[PDB]
Amino acid sequence: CPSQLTTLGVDGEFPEVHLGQWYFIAGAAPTKEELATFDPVDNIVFNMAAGSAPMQLHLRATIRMKDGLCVPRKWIYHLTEGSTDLRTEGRPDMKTELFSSSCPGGIMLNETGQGYQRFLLYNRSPHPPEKCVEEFKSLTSCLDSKAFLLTPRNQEACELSN
């Protein structure tokens, strides 16, 4: 260990490049309780799009549960003025920071809320090379987030409109 943690900033375009679909690959956190929300998940496809009011972004997803069910979700994020952090509507305690990852099609989030933090790994590919997952696990372990979750991604993605 020692960060090679590299921030992606939107205070400085980031939006246009990151539009479209992303897959949830893995999470890491100080303990398992703060990842357990993902235990029933087989896979998740997300779609990010521009918002319709200043500083807003639309995030949509469909979650494939391990029991085969498809569950639509949506959130509205807000870019904090003069900051690299994002807020999420309806969750006043929550903050998200974005980081580059070792793999080309990847992106890493750190989420914090009341009492917890977690790192979350996404990729443009639903099945990125195993090296991407390993590098994520190593980076986060060194940052003291040693509890780990890998999404199994054994089922098909659910439908999510463009």
Ligand X SMILES: CCCCCCCCCCCCC/C=C/[C@@H](O)[C@@H](N)COP(=O)(O)O
135 is in an annotated binding site: no
- Footprint of ligand X on residues 83-112 (CB under 6 A)? 86, 98, 107, 109, 111
- Neighbouring CB atoms inside 10 A of 110's CB total 21
22 part of the interface to ligand X, by CB under 6 A: yes
Q: Is 43 helix (H, G, I), strand (E, B) or coil?
A: strand
| Burial label, 91 (beta-carbon count in 10 A; 0-12, 13-18, 19+) | middle
Residue ranges of E strands in 30-90: 41-50, 56-65, 70-79, 86-88
81 is in an annotated binding site: no
Residue ranges of E strands in the chain: 20-29, 41-50, 56-65, 70-79, 86-88, 91-99, 106-113, 116-123, 147-150
Output 2 or 16, the one with its CB closest to ligand X.
Answer: 16
Task: Please state, in angstroms and rounded to a whole number, the distance separating the CA atoms of residues 96 and 112.
Answer: 6
Q: How far is the CB of 37 from ligand X (least distance, A)?
A: 6
Q: Which of 5, 48, 70, 76 binds ligand X (CB under 6 A)?
A: 48
37 part of the interface to ligand X, by CB under 6 A: yes
Output 18 or 95, the one with its CB closest to ligand X.
Answer: 18
132 part of the interface to ligand X, by CB under 6 A: no
Q: What residues line the site for ligand X (CB under 6 A)? A: 18, 22, 37, 46, 48, 57, 59, 77, 86, 98, 107, 109, 111, 120, 122
Which amino acids are annotated as binding site for tetradecanoate, given as ranges?
Answer: 111, 118
